[PDB]
Amino acid sequence: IDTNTVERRIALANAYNETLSRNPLLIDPFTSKLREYARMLEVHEQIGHVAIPSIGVDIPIYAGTSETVLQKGSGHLEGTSLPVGGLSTHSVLTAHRGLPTARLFTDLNKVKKGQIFYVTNIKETLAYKVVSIKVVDPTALSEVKIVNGKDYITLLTCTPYMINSHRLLVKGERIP
Ligand SMILES: [Ca+2]
């Protein structure tokens, strides 16, 4: 796609991000029951890719967290910022703590503070440095709000392994 088209679409994503309420009510995607909100970012139905070389993961990102999406890649939590970076953005990307055939976020618990993951979209590849690692009740995801003046992406999965009673949140902060 041509540069001028990419920039218009990114401008749309930014406008969307700057419209978001800073205080979503995020419901646990794993225990809950077709999305157009991220159409500007979509190429063949994917909005991006998330790579965590620290653990050998590189998987596609799709809009929403339907079970169809989570079977095949990472799902973007609607109500959070779209993964294009910027101040006052906080995107949440979700994936299973492993599937039969796919590692997905199986080893997210092995990511450490200071390590760097990458989110690639139609425009560029963004780098995020891990700054926090937390475990919370599934019924507590709303806290994962957009923080004024910060550019964050949280990677979200279930824990402990093979139990999945709780949720692991690994938050990275934009490296400018
Ligand atoms: Ca929609």
Author numbering: 57 to 89, 94 to 236
Extract from the study:
The pilin subunits of GBS are assembled into high molecular weight polymers via a transpeptidation reaction catalyzed by specific pilin-associated class C sortases, through a common mechanism involving specific motifs present in the pilin proteins. In this work, we present the high-resolution crystal structures of SrtC2 and SrtC1 from GBS PI-1.
Like SrtC1, SrtC2 is predicted to form two N-terminal α-helices; absence of electron density for the first α-helix of SrtC2 is likely an artifact of crystallization that may be due constraints imposed by crystal packing or simply to local disorder in this N-terminal region of the structure, as commonly observed in crystal structures. The aromatic ring of Phe86 in SrtC2 forms an aromatic-sulfur interaction with the catalytic Cys that has been previously observed in other pilus-related sortases. In both enzymes, the catalytic residues are not accessible to pilin substrates, suggesting that the enzymes cannot bind substrates in this conformation.
